[PDB]
Amino acid sequence: ITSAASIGKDGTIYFGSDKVYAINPDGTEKWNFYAGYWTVTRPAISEDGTIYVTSLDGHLYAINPDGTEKWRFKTEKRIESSPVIGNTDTIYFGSYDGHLYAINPDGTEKWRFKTNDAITSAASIGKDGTIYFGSDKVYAINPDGTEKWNFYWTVTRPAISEDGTIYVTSLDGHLYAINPDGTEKWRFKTEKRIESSPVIGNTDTIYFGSYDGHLYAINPDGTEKWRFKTNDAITSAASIGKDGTIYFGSDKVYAINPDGTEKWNFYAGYWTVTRPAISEDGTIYVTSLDGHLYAINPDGTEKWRFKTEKR
């Protein structure tokens, strides 16, 4: 209904709801773009500033930085993954019946890769352009569209460290560290349902939430670092600030120090809040289901709010 925010190179904050919104860092609206009946994906931003969203009307929209339509790609099947931008401006997303599409930056289809079952989480891209996504297996696809390897359900998105290690959280509570050649490096068992994608923070620590309200911090050697208990569910991914603070949403926006203690928490309404986005200056942006975009100072005070047109 309302996407999380994505931050452009000039600090512009984009999010999707009834429209795609471009918000200047002072909280003033730069432009809004009508992408069909409704926007359904978190906007993805190319290195040249193109903004990509999927619409309820069945199209992938490419939007220029000035808020004008660049092109549309009609998706055959219902798209279940948000667009992901490859290393050379290729756009990847997945369909409900297991098709991974690669779209050239000019709106033409590059290739499609069929898997057995639905692709409901986003892909992640390695340094050499490899495309990793989960499903029944974890798949690694070469940029040319041929399969590299697969690794033995997951409803989350792979996180990739600087050395190429791939981290995946499975629904039954494993965190797998996978080597780039597709062999298991280690697994860590939580025995808890996990519906949140991992994120790699300070000194390659891996963080993820459990449904029952624990934020886990795992060292890159496969050993537990700490937990942090909320008394609400965690079903979304966390984000790391430049000073290592870990930000996630539950009943509130939490800010957690790298040592596992709470720094602050911010109340952003009665609705579910989305994954926090962090700008270079430390500002934290969160959206709520009812079309509010919050800008939060790193000390936890509200900078400004923005409200959508239809909400």
Residue numbers at the binding site for Na ion (CB under 5 A): 226-227, 260
**Smaller CB distance to Na ion: residue 171 or 233?**
233
Smallest gap from residue 257 Cβ to Na ion (A): 11
Total length of the chain: 311
List the end-to-end C-alpha distance of the chain, in Å, as a whole number: 9
DSSP 3: P
Nearer to Na ion, 27 or 260 (CB): 260
CA distance 133 to 83: 12
Least separation, in Å, of the C-beta of 254 and Na ion?
13
Secondary structure E strands in 90-195: 91-94, 99-103, 109-114, 124-125, 131-134, 138-141, 147-151, 159-160, 166-169, 174-178, 184-189
Rounded to a whole number of angstroms, the minimum distance from the CB of residue 133 to Na ion is 32
CA distance 138 to 201: 22
DSSP 74-114: E-SSPB-S--EE-TTS-EEEEBTTSEEEEE-TTS-EEEEEE
Shortest reach from residue 286's CB to Na ion, in Å? 23
Which residue lies nearer to Na ion by CB, 227 or 311?
Answer: 227
If the CB atoms of residues 130 and 250 are measured against Na ion, the closer one turns out to be 250
Closest separation in Å from C-beta 212 to Na ion: 15
SS3 of the chain: helix, strand, coil, percent, to 5 = 0, 45, 55
DSSP lists the bridge partners of residue 91 as: 85, 103
Return the number of the residue (114 or 229) whose C-beta is nearest Na ion. 229
**Distance of alpha carbon 190 from alpha carbon 18, whole angstroms:** 38
Q: By C-beta, is 78 or 227 nearer to Na ion?
A: 227
* CB of residue 109 to Na ion, shortest distance in Å: 48
Rank residues 226 and 304 by Cβ distance to Na ion and give the closer one.
Answer: 226
Which is it for strands 13-16 and 6-7: parallel, antiparallel or unpaired? antiparallel
In whole angstroms, the minimum distance from the beta carbon of 226 to Na ion comes to 5
